[PDB]
Write a structure and sequence with these properties.
Layout: H1 4-7, H2 10-20, H3 37-43, H4 47-53, H5 63-69
């Protein structure tokens, strides 16, 4: 769940996620301003990534609200 999420390079994030396999990178980590994986990606509308990113691992509680807010 590295900065790739932003770049929206699905493969990269996908790889990193798999490569992470409970690795250093905290999928549920926050950026400089708090954005979690789902969040930083909700805003940039990478629904593709979010398709399963949210299926598991990625923390997301206020995401619905994030989504609604981001319409």
């Amino acid at each position: 769940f590295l900065l790739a999420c932003d770049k929206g390079d699905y493969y990269m994030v996908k790889k990193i996620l798999e490569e992470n396999s409970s690795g250093d990178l905290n999928i549920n980590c926050v950026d400089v301003l708090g954005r979690n994986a789902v969040t930083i990606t909700i805003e940039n509308e990478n629904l593709d990534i979010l398709q399963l990113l949210l299926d598991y691992g990625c923390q997301s509680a206020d995401a619905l609200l994030v989504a609604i807010d981001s319409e």
